[PDB]
């Protein structure tokens, strides 16, 4: 039940930004390289209503909601809550898009590794009802009183899925572009009142972003987000789609993606119909790559892979054959390779270029479908 620390040189900080306070403003968790490395560790799932959301998502009873709370409610992630940003450089920025039933905090294994290598990571929380739960404030007085308003996962009928999944991944793309704009506006001084009263001052992020070096990363629905997002906003220079779920994308986007794009898949999630859509994005004029992590399952990319033991994990499909640490290191080192290659990072990550090709015992070049 331990999320792995950042393997890179930088001490990693973490905080939450919401702005504006509304249903229509941006909500994200930042993972950044931190000055001091001796703040408290960050509360992994920091409100009760998330556990209730996960129950509604998993399809448990009113009960397991508080079970999950009992077992996980006090779990931390190895990021220095509200630590000062490490000054003296413009860091590359990743926007990260959670999967269905996820929310902003469940991809901390990946955020903390990227920050420990020099990235700022904004992990958005979508308000398309794709999250188990999210929240916002109704009006200023509410945000002033801390009066949270909770939006829970929407379950769909067979007859809705096509249409509403598409409207949701568009809203997800919009949300990734809005988070990018909020962060770039903060980088250039626009004053912002965080709707969460937190010990991190947001004036710290002034001239902290390398505004030419931006990538969108996302698991599952998050992989569809990446693809849709890249389609709509070229500020995103390349995309990494972790185990994309391609159902939400209209046929129109496969034409419409200039930026390099890297499919990192688990062995046991993928299927013909889905793989056939990934292939649609390929073209001789554009850089697409695809590796499959051997032994991996869909959930090997999110942090619940790390929240139980061997036998319980494989029981609930949060763990596969491969070790969880091996799989996120491979995912993460191939990620850092693709980011250096296509953002132009002045770093040592090209040592892992062989992973982008799937030359490792635990990688399959392309797909097993």
């Amino acid at each position: 039940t331990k999320i792995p620390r950042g393997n890179g040189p930088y001490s990693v900080g973490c905080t939450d930004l919401m702005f504006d306070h509304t249903n229509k403003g941006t909500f994200l968790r930042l993972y950044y390289p931190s000055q001091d490395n001796d703040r408290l560790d960050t509360l992994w799932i920091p409100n009760k209503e998330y556990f209730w959301g996960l129950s509604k998502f998993l399809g448990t009873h009113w009960l397991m909601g508080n079970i999950l709370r009992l077992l996980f409610g006090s779990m931390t992630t190895p990021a220095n809550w509200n630590s000062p940003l490490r000054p003296g450089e413009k860091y590359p920025l990743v926007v990260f898009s959670h999967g269905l039933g996820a929310f902003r905090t469940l991809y901390s294994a990946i955020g903390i590794d990227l920050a420990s290598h020099g990235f700022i990571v904004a992990a958005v929380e979508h308000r398309d009802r794709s999250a188990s739960a999210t929240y916002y404030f109704k009006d200023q007085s509410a945000a002033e009183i801390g009066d949270k308003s909770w939006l829970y996962l929407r379950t769909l009928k067979q007859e809705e899925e096509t249409h509403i999944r598409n409207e949701q991944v568009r809203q997800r793309a919009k949300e990734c572009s809005q988070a990018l704009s909020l962060i770039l506006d903060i980088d250039h001084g626009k004053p912002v009142k965080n709707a969460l009263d937190l010990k991190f001052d947001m004036e710290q992020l002034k001239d902290s972003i390398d505004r030419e070096k931006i990538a969108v990363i996302g698991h599952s629905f998050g992989g569809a987000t990446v693809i849709q997002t890249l389609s709509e906003d070229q500020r995103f220079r390349c995309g990494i789609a972790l185990d994309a779920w391609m159902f939400p994308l209209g046929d129109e986007v496969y034409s419409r993606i200039p930026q390099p794009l890297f499919f990192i898949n688990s062995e046991y999630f993928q299927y013909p119909a889905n793989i056939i859509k990934m292939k649609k994005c390929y073209s001789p004029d554009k850089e697409r790559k695809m590796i499959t992590i051997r032994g991996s399952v869909h959930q090997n990319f999110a942090d619940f892979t790390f929240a139980t033991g061997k036998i319980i994990g494989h029981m609930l499909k949060l763990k596969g054959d491969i070790d969880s640490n091996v799989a996120i290191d491979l995912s993460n080192k191939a990620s850092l390779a693709f980011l250096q290659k296509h953002l132009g990072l002045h770093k040592d990550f090209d040592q892992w270029d062989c992973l982008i090709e799937g030359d490792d015992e635990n990688l399959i070049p392309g797909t097993n479908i």
Side-chain angles (χ1 to χ4, degrees), residues 3-10 12-23 25-34 37-38 40-42 44-47 49-55 57 59 64-69 71-89 91-139 141-150 152-156 160-163 165-166 168-173 175-189 191-192 194-198 200-202 204-205 207-231 233 235-250 252-254 256-275 277-279 281-309 312-314 316 318-340 342-346 349-369:
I3 295 169
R5 277 150 29 215
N7 290 338
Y10 301 104
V12 170
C14 178
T15 193
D16 292 300
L17 170 55
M18 171 179 320
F19 188 85
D20 72 13
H21 62 272
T22 78
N23 198 46
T26 293
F27 187 24
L28 56 82
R29 178 158 282 207
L30 279 180
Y31 315 94
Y32 54 79
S34 75
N37 213 319
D38 58 14
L40 228 57
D41 267 28
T42 288
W44 177 46
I45 307 177
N47 307 69
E49 296 76 346
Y50 288 105
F51 294 112
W52 295 350
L54 272 176
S55 191
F57 172 59
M64 197 156 172
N66 304 90
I67 298 184
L68 289 168
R69 194 194 177 172
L71 301 186
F72 303 117
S74 225
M75 277 207 68
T76 55
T77 175
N80 296 346
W81 182 245
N82 272 307
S83 168
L85 186 61
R86 182 178 160 287
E89 206 194 340
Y91 304 102
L93 174 69
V94 165
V95 176
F96 194 105
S97 197
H98 63 78
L100 220 220
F103 49 96
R104 77 174 187 282
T105 68
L106 296 196
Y107 296 93
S108 76
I110 287 164
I112 289 172
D113 207 43
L114 283 179
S116 81
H117 282 104
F119 282 82
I120 289 171
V121 183
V124 303
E125 193 148 296
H126 299 284
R127 268 76 168 264
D128 58 349
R129 254 151 66 80
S130 70
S132 269
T134 195
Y135 67 101
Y136 60 101
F137 307 99
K138 261 327 187 288
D139 66 358
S141 108
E144 177 150 8
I145 272 91
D147 201 333
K148 289 171 290 122
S149 284
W150 288 90
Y152 289 93
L153 191 87
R154 187 172 189 193
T155 66
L156 302 181
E160 296 169 313
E161 267 265 359
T162 313
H163 172 67
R165 289 313 180 188
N166 195 281
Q168 279 180 318
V169 70
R170 283 173 193 288
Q171 195 194 130
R172 282 156 146 272
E175 283 178 335
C176 292
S177 269
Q178 203 145 108
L180 176 50
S181 292
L182 173 52
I183 300 290
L184 282 173
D185 285 13
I186 290 168
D187 178 51
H188 280 154
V192 301
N194 191 349
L196 313 184
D197 192 74
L198 295 188
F200 191 84
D201 177 63
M202 293 291 168
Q204 267 187 279
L205 283 158
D207 300 338
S208 60
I209 306 305
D210 192 326
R211 309 162 61 88
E212 301 182 358
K213 295 205 191 62
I214 307 177
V216 47
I217 308 179
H219 175 236
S220 180
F221 206 162
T225 307
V226 169
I227 287 174
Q228 180 77 55
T229 297
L230 282 184
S231 203
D233 188 355
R235 290 174 302 165
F236 296 101
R237 292 291 57 217
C238 70
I240 305 171
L242 315 183
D243 220 24
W245 182 54
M246 310 288 278
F247 174 69
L249 304 169
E252 89 287 352
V253 307
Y254 300 112
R256 302 174 154 61
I257 308 145
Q259 312 91 311
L261 181 58
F262 186 24
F263 298 97
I264 308 173
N265 291 353
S266 71
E267 202 172 292
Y268 297 131
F269 170 78
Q270 288 292 327
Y271 58 103
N274 206 55
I275 288 288
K277 302 312 189 33
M278 292 186 188
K279 285 197 185 208
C281 312
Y282 279 63
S283 201
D285 49 8
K286 280 146 185 160
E287 200 39 65
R288 282 75 185 86
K289 296 219 154 149
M290 180 191 293
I291 65 167
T292 300
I293 295 170
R294 197 185 290 275
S296 46
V297 287
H298 199 50
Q299 218 52 49
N300 253 122
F301 294 108
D303 292 351
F304 265 116
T305 199
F306 297 105
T308 86
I312 301 306
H314 322 76
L316 285 328
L318 307 182
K319 290 189 171 290
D321 313 314
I322 192 166
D323 175 34
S324 280
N325 273 64
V326 174
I328 211 66
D329 275 10
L330 277 177
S331 184
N332 285 332
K333 285 174 202 186
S335 287
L336 288 166
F338 192 78
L339 287 188
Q340 179 175 313
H342 297 280
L343 290 191
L345 297 185
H346 208 310
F349 309 160
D350 52 308
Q351 72 192 284
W352 300 308
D353 280 345
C354 55
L355 302 186
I356 295 181
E357 317 274 312
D359 190 304
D360 189 288
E361 300 176 335
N362 292 312
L363 301 188
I364 301 158
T367 189
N368 50 306
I369 314 288

